[PDB]
Amino acid sequence: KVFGRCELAAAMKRHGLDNYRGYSLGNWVCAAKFESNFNTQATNRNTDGSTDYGILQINSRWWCNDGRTPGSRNLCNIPCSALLSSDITASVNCAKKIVSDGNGMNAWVAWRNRCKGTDVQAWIRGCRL
Ligand SMILES: [Cl-]
Ligand SMILES: [Cl-]
Ligand SMILES: [Cl-]
Ligand SMILES: [Cl-]
Ligand SMILES: [Cl-]
Ligand SMILES: [Cl-]
Ligand SMILES: [Cl-]
Ligand SMILES: [Cl-]
Ligand code: NA
């Protein structure tokens, strides 16, 4: 599923991501934009052989199991495929665990490079939330 900007904002808010670990909703929408362009089915292979999955491009090296990332962990205890669903629940619950692990949203490289320090509020501007 390819989300609209305000549509994703609303789904994110409903699943408790808004100001989770102090990160306003705009941060999460901006990260989703540049990680997946709002596409729940986005996948991308990393050089090390791991793969990033879903609207927030969660990586198989640590967070989910895809059966082909030798020596990886599955800290969110989910198949990586579950992160590709039109329902964002699994991606949200995993993101909550990721953003809590010490480095905040810097875990998402696109967020650090393209969202951090910017007017993230622009991403939820105009949305009926
Ligand atoms: Cl947009
Ligand atoms: Cl915001
Ligand atoms: Cl394969
Ligand atoms: Cl594996
Ligand atoms: Cl594990
Ligand atoms: Cl699995
Ligand atoms: Cl949803
Ligand atoms: Cl933080
Ligand atoms: Na894994």
Tab-separated table of C-alpha atoms and ligand atoms in Angstrom:
chain	number	residue	atom	x	y	z
A	1	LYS	CA	0.000	0.000	0.000
A	2	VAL	CA	1.192	3.487	-0.874
A	3	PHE	CA	0.035	5.864	1.853
A	4	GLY	CA	-0.906	9.493	1.424
A	5	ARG	CA	0.994	11.898	3.689
A	6	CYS	CA	-1.935	12.821	5.944
A	7	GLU	CA	-3.298	9.263	5.824
A	8	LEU	CA	-0.033	7.867	7.206
A	9	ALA	CA	0.179	10.606	9.816
A	10	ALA	CA	-3.255	9.555	11.064
A	11	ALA	CA	-2.427	5.840	11.088
A	12	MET	CA	0.816	6.614	12.898
A	13	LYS	CA	-0.959	8.715	15.503
A	14	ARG	CA	-3.573	6.028	16.049
A	15	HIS	CA	-0.836	3.442	16.681
A	16	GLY	CA	0.747	5.653	19.340
A	17	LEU	CA	3.820	6.889	17.475
A	18	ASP	CA	3.043	10.594	17.900
A	19	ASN	CA	5.672	11.959	20.333
A	20	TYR	CA	6.855	8.423	21.101
A	21	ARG	CA	10.239	8.777	22.852
A	22	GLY	CA	9.713	12.519	22.346
A	23	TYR	CA	9.661	12.397	18.536
A	24	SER	CA	6.799	14.455	17.122
A	25	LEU	CA	4.599	12.910	14.416
A	26	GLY	CA	6.311	15.057	11.781
A	27	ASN	CA	9.588	13.207	12.388
A	28	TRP	CA	7.993	9.819	11.790
A	29	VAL	CA	6.200	10.949	8.621
A	30	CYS	CA	9.397	12.531	7.274
A	31	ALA	CA	11.381	9.343	8.006
A	32	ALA	CA	8.740	7.239	6.243
A	33	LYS	CA	8.824	9.579	3.241
A	34	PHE	CA	12.545	9.254	2.668
A	35	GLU	CA	12.877	5.605	3.761
A	36	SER	CA	10.046	4.154	1.622
A	37	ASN	CA	8.251	7.034	-0.109
A	38	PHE	CA	5.266	5.881	1.978
A	39	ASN	CA	5.233	2.438	0.324
A	40	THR	CA	4.570	-0.396	2.778
A	41	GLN	CA	5.993	-2.914	0.281
A	42	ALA	CA	9.379	-1.217	-0.087
A	43	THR	CA	12.365	-3.573	0.240
A	44	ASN	CA	16.063	-2.803	-0.297
A	45	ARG	CA	19.094	-5.065	-0.063
A	46	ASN	CA	22.118	-3.844	1.876
A	47	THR	CA	25.709	-4.591	0.855
A	48	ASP	CA	26.261	-6.750	3.933
A	49	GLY	CA	23.487	-9.073	2.730
A	50	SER	CA	20.800	-7.843	5.104
A	51	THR	CA	17.564	-6.316	3.789
A	52	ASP	CA	15.446	-3.329	4.867
A	53	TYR	CA	11.664	-3.783	4.905
A	54	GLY	CA	8.571	-1.675	4.842
A	55	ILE	CA	7.420	1.848	5.393
A	56	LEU	CA	10.294	2.490	7.839
A	57	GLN	CA	12.868	0.199	6.186
A	58	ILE	CA	13.540	-1.951	9.232
A	59	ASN	CA	16.686	-4.023	8.816
A	60	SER	CA	16.878	-7.817	8.933
A	61	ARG	CA	20.344	-7.770	10.574
A	62	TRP	CA	18.779	-6.936	13.928
A	63	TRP	CA	15.032	-6.619	14.010
A	64	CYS	CA	13.214	-9.245	11.932
A	65	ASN	CA	13.729	-12.669	10.403
A	66	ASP	CA	13.896	-13.159	6.640
A	67	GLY	CA	15.734	-16.467	6.748
A	68	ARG	CA	18.645	-15.213	4.655
A	69	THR	CA	20.684	-12.911	6.912
A	70	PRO	CA	23.360	-15.153	8.520
A	71	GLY	CA	24.131	-14.304	12.140
A	72	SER	CA	21.323	-11.793	12.391
A	73	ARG	CA	18.958	-11.281	15.297
A	74	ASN	CA	15.161	-10.984	15.283
A	75	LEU	CA	14.640	-8.586	18.175
A	76	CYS	CA	11.099	-7.618	17.171
A	77	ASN	CA	10.301	-11.345	16.924
A	78	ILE	CA	8.518	-11.116	13.575
A	79	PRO	CA	8.983	-12.348	10.037
A	80	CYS	CA	10.303	-9.476	7.917
A	81	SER	CA	7.336	-10.067	5.592
A	82	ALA	CA	5.006	-8.859	8.351
A	83	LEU	CA	6.662	-5.463	7.908
A	84	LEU	CA	5.336	-5.257	4.337
A	85	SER	CA	1.629	-5.329	5.232
A	86	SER	CA	-0.857	-2.568	4.391
A	87	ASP	CA	-1.565	-2.582	8.149
A	88	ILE	CA	1.325	-0.698	9.746
A	89	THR	CA	0.932	-2.184	13.234
A	90	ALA	CA	3.973	-4.486	13.053
A	91	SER	CA	6.207	-1.746	11.594
A	92	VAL	CA	5.081	0.670	14.301
A	93	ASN	CA	5.670	-1.769	17.150
A	94	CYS	CA	9.111	-2.569	15.807
A	95	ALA	CA	9.977	1.114	15.293
A	96	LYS	CA	9.048	1.681	18.934
A	97	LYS	CA	11.629	-0.903	19.968
A	98	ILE	CA	14.258	0.503	17.580
A	99	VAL	CA	13.860	4.141	18.665
A	100	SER	CA	14.166	3.035	22.299
A	101	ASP	CA	17.483	1.225	21.951
A	102	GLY	CA	19.730	4.195	22.749
A	103	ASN	CA	20.319	6.288	19.628
A	104	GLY	CA	16.788	7.545	19.101
A	105	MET	CA	15.776	8.143	15.489
A	106	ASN	CA	19.426	8.243	14.390
A	107	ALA	CA	18.871	4.520	13.790
A	108	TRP	CA	17.226	5.692	10.549
A	109	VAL	CA	19.978	7.054	8.342
A	110	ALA	CA	17.566	8.933	6.056
A	111	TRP	CA	16.026	10.596	9.116
A	112	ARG	CA	19.430	11.759	10.318
A	113	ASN	CA	20.427	12.965	6.857
A	114	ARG	CA	17.139	14.350	5.582
A	115	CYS	CA	14.790	15.043	8.515
A	116	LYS	CA	16.829	15.833	11.622
A	117	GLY	CA	17.141	19.580	12.212
A	118	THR	CA	14.563	20.403	9.531
A	119	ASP	CA	11.031	21.755	9.703
A	120	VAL	CA	9.508	18.303	10.236
A	121	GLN	CA	6.195	19.913	11.189
A	122	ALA	CA	5.692	20.636	7.475
A	123	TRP	CA	5.020	16.907	7.009
A	124	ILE	CA	1.822	17.001	9.092
A	125	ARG	CA	0.803	20.564	8.182
A	126	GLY	CA	-2.795	20.798	7.016
A	127	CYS	CA	-3.670	17.269	8.150
A	128	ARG	CA	-6.920	16.600	9.993
A	129	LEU	CA	-5.514	14.765	13.002
B	1	CL	CL	4.169	13.881	0.257
B	2	CL	CL	5.754	17.557	13.988
B	3	CL	CL	17.198	-14.847	-1.597
B	4	CL	CL	18.533	-15.177	8.874
B	5	CL	CL	16.845	-12.364	18.122
B	6	CL	CL	9.973	-15.739	11.048
B	7	CL	CL	-2.655	0.903	9.277
B	8	CL	CL	16.301	10.716	21.684
B	9	NA	NA	17.277	-11.248	11.275
